[PDB]
From a paper:
This study delved into the unknown function of SegC (SSO0033), a novel protein thought to be involved in chromosome segregation in archaea. The segC (sso0033) gene encodes a 165-residue hypothetical protein of unknown function.
From Fo – Fc ligand omit electron density map, we observed an additional electron density in the interface of the two dimers under the ATP-soaked condition, which was not observed in apo-form density map. Based on the shape and size of the electron density, we can only fit an ADP molecule. In this SegC-ADP complex structure, two residues (Tyr61 and Arg73) were found to interact with ADP. Residue Arg73 forms hydrogen-bond interactions with two phosphate groups, and residue Tyr61 is involved in a π–π stacking interaction with adenine. However, these two residues are located more than 4 Å away from ADP. The results showed that the NTPase activity of the SegC-Y61A mutant was increased 49% relative to wild-type SegC (SegC-WT), whereas that of SegC-R73A mutant was decreased by 35% compared to SegC-WT.
Numbering used by the authors:
A (entry chain A), B (entry chain B): 1 to 165
Amino acid sequence: MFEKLYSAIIYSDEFKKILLGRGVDDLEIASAYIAFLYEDLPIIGKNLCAAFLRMGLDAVYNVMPSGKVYSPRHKLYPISRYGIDGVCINCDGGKIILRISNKGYDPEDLLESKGLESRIFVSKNFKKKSMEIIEKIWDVNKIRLIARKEILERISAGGILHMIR
Amino acid sequence: MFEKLYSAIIYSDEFKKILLGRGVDDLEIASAYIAFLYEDLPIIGKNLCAAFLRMGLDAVYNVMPSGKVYSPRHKLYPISRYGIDGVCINCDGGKIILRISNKGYDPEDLLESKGLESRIFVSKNFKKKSMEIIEKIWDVNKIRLIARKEILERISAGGILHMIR
Ligand SMILES: Nc1ncnc2c1ncn2[C@@H]1O[C@H](COP(=O)(O)OP(=O)(O)O)[C@@H](O)[C@H]1O
Ligand SMILES: Nc1ncnc2c1ncn2[C@@H]1O[C@H](COP(=O)(O)OP(=O)(O)O)[C@@H](O)[C@H]1O
Ligand SMILES: [Mg+2]
């Protein structure tokens, strides 16, 4: 069921390593959860994994130099424009501000949440908790090598430089 | 004895596909042969394969968006400048001019060459004949696959954006 969500988090994580030398964040992975739940909610800010969840490999063409995705068709924005009442992953604009707290949802406890509130918070170490869930269920290293080879096949289609425009 | 030369031709072909989405030219391959005979001769324009021969994976950091390499430490120059008495791959600068001809050198005959003419010529389908040699010696697919893993390993650790500077 969460097969769409956990795949996004592995693929975004590999692509981000190819593109910026590092892997996805606590809050960037959190954005994939929020979007797995509310599929017509605009995700503003650090939103790379939501963008893989909604766009597949095609997010690769829309990622800004910041790792934020602009793709208004899939309601992904890097900053808040007028009238977008979306979730702001680590920013103060939009309708709903998502950041980190001691007493903030876990990976499990967030999937459960039935409402959307004016302020959303997620637990420290959200990525570590979410990688363990995926690890117990999948062979993640077999997936990562398959992810890298497909992302490279994408990038090599028109070449890195094409993909930058 | 020629392994190092034939590895550069297979590594550059995999790297150019990742950067510009297409293989290497007849003349880009020819430049590597030249780099192999004349270890101090400066090579000007169309030098992606001579760059791998002279720099290894460290060439990825010195590629212009044209796929020409600028590394003066290694006597590699994308355009001719005053006083660089080198071979010019498919330009009219420097001292020697390398260009395709109907009668030009073969891979075997260019290797066997002893002089340095004021004008070298390589046969049409220099790349075809050169890939037909290398394919008789190794399972090239096992190489391209390794070259990719190592090219990606290099790109990734920096981040594609660090590398494009
Ligand atoms: N640079 C491009 N190259 C090829 N096709 C494109 C390009 N830009 C847009 N399209 C196409 O135009 C249509 C509109 O897409 P668009 O709304 O521009 O995408 P996005 O919401 O990701 O910015 C789509 O069918 C898409 O496939
Ligand atoms: N990880 C890296 N390892 C080695 N060289 C790098 C790396 N990242 C970037 N470079 C760049 O590659 C180039 C290779 O050296 P070169 O231009 O020949 O001599 P110099 O050291 O004088 O700049 C340098 O311009 C350097 O800034
Ligand atoms: Mg060409």
